């Protein structure tokens, strides 16, 4: 379970605290939080604080629980009593709780890990100083490689990160210094050759330097935007930046200056092809570049909205605004209406064009205000929440579905944890003595055997002689032919729809507003089913006697009673009530 801007634990404190290892001072706690193994997770002060408080609270908790159980050698809900230990019900209950809580723990940590490699702000920097080829290659193949559709973009990503690191070098914090070792250590293929197939060209690198200098790229984020837009035919337009881009004279001059200044130590076209991807990960020669790449992804990611800096690229990277327009309406409506209908009378044509204009105006008017109001409404669980709605753009943002799977697993675990309450704890004896005074009676005091349940309705609408006939016999066989499987799928699907409709009507039957609407869903569904049945039936009879064959059997069934004109109430059975009454109950909304 997670919502936007929530903290999740990536640490397992529980294991050590069950062994009895506890921390007192803050120094001890910092010592508890630091991975020996290669990776280094930095933290914001805030997250670190939160985590600390949680740690202390868990100390107090395990402490008081243990002390309670040493005194008795949990604490019940208000009106309840503890069943004895070594009672089946209590053993089962406690078991249930153990399992549920392990699940919830794992889920918490898994969502924490998603946060960690999604680069959520409270995990500001992942440091790789201690890794060896194994760790680096693996990190690469799990994080960078697998995700990417395009191979060639990975190289670009690498060089551009190298350029950003090399150009922004002063402003980086001290903990970053190690990575620059890898930057000066990068190996390039000689200018036009054993490394030509292994490593990229220097020319390329200077193209990307040109890009960092011309568009002022400070981030992996703007990096992302630039790298997606730069090879496209509209490039100048997409990447046109709010502080306007520097003029290529100065830039190419500064690139000449860097190129030359770096020679004495030992409009540029978009670069060519690069060596096949595998080289990067499997040649020792590229190992420093690889390193940069990882460092580029796990750090170098900052909150900022790239679409303040590149306001024209917002439409391309993520979807455009619907309130933003990149014939007359009447002519469109004419095209849909076909040639078989009269053309719109030219009154209505003119009138509709008028609306089309007024709507254009409404769009233009509300475009800004809707955006503003929307973000302000998000900043204020609450109606507005999500896994990710953040104001800022995150190119590594996790897929909604990975998070939702976890959440669902955690909610199962919660319901499981809640079950066990009635196993471990019990009501007062004489309360159940009292309770057994009013017996359960079949007729009145027991819920009726027909409740709303989807198979109850599916059964009811499959119990009709015509539809039972259509399913089994009537349609050409589902396995034998293609028409068979097609017709079968559609008949089944339509039954299913009408069933869902009746079901949702039955559940909400008591409240009028919802019932009239759900009722309209029943009408639409039933109409669909009726047209299918009617058609297929006619087909059966027309299609081209012998005793007891298909057609005779069909004509014996009689007239097909339409599911539309059926009057079924809440229990899925025809009503007791007078037709005038039933009709009024189910009438459309206004």
């Amino acid at each position: 379970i997670t919502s936007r801007g929530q903290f999740n634990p990536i640490h397992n404190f529980s294991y050590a605290m069950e062994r009895g290892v506890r921390a007192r001072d803050v120094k001890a706690f910092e010592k508890l939080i630091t991975n020996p193994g290669p990776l280094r997770v930095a933290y914001t002060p805030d997250y670190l604080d939160w985590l600390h408080r949680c740690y202390k609270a868990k100390g107090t908790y395990m402490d008081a629980r243990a002390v309670a159980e040493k005194k008795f050698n949990g604490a019940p809900p208000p009106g309840m009593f503890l069943r004895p230990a070594h009672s089946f019900r209590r053993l089962a209950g406690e078991l249930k709780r153990r399992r549920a809580q392990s699940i919830l723990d794992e889920v918490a940590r898994a969502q924490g890990m998603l946060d960690l490699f999604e680069r959520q702000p409270h995990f500001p920097a992942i440091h790789i100083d201690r890794c060896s080829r194994f760790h680096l290659v693996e990190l690469f193949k799990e994080m960078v490689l697998e995700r990417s559709l395009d191979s060639n973009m990975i190289w670009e990503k690498a060089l551009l990160y190298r350029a950003i690191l090399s150009e922004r070098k002063p402003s980086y914090p001290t903990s970053f210094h190690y990575i620059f070792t890898a930057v000066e250590d990068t190996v390039f293929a000689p200018t036009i050759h054993p490394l030509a197939a292994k490593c990229p060209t220097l020319e390329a690198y200077y193209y990307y330097v040109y890009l960092v200098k011309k568009y002022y790229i400070d981030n992996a984020v703007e990096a992302h935007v630039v790298l997606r837009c730069h090879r496209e035919p509209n490039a100048a337009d997409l990447l046109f930046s709010n502080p306007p881009p520097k003029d290529d004279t100065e830039i190419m001059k500064a690139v000449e200056l860097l190129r030359n200044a770096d020679i004495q130590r030992g409009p540029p076209v978009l670069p060519g092809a690069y060596p096949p991807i595998d080289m990067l990960w499997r040649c020792e020669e590229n190992l420093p570049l690889l390193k940069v790449l990882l460092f580029g992804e796990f750090n170098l990611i900052v909150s900022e909205n790239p679409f303040v800096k590149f306001p024209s690229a917002h439409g391309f990277l993520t979807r455009p605004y619907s309130t933003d327009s990149s014939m007359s309406l009447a002519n469109v409506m004419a095209e849909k209406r076909g040639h078989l209908l009269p053309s719109l009378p030219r009154n209505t044509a003119t009138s509709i064009d008028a609306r089309a204009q007024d709507i254009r105006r409404l769009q233009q008017k509300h475009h800004r205000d809707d955006i503003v109001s929307f973000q302000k409404l998000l900043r204020t669980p609450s109606a507005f929440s999500s896994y990710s709605d953040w104001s800022y753009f995150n190119p590594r943002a996790v897929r909604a579905e990975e998070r939702d799977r976890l959440t669902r697993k955690a909610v199962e675990a919660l319901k499981l944890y809640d079950s066990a309450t009635n196993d471990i704890y019990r009501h007062s004896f004489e309360d159940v003595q009292a309770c057994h005074t009013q017996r359960v009676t079949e007729r009145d005091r027991t819920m009726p055997p027909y409740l709303p349940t989807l198979p109850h309705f599916v059964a009811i609408i499959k119990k009709d002689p015509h539809i039972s006939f259509l399913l089994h016999i009537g349609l050409p066989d589902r396995n034998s032919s293609e028409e068979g499987s097609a017709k079968h799928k559609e008949l089944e699907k339509r039954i299913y729809y009408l069933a869902r409709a009746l079901y949702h009507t039955a559940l909400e039957y008591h409240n009028e507003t919802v019932r009239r609407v759900n009722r309209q869903k029943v009408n639409v569904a039933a109409s669909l089913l009726d047209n299918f049945v009617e058609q297929e039936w006619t087909t059966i009879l027309r299609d081209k006697d012998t005793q007891n064959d298909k057609k005779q059997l069909a004509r014996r069934l009689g007239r097909y009673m339409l599911f539309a004109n059926r009057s079924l109430d809440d229990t899925g059975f025809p009503t007791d009530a007078r037709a005038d009454d039933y009709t009024r109950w189910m009438a459309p909304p206004s």
Binding site: E512, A577, R578, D580, D581, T583, R584, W585, A587
Partner: protein, 49 residues
């Protein structure tokens, strides 16, 4: 189509705003809840042939 809602006219001062019609209710054959023409306060049409 008339609302039984209260009027400021002097002749209609006796008229009191009516509660909304009862939801799932079984009427007597000569009455209706008075919602629509299809469902009048007083059913005028006979139910025979």
């Amino acid at each position: 189509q008339t609302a039984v809602n209260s009027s400021d006219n002097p002749m209609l001062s006796s008229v009191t705003t009516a509660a909304p019609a009862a939801d799932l209710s079984r009427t007597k054959p000569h009455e209706g809840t008075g919602t629509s023409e299809r469902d009048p306060y007083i059913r005028t049409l006979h139910n025979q042939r």
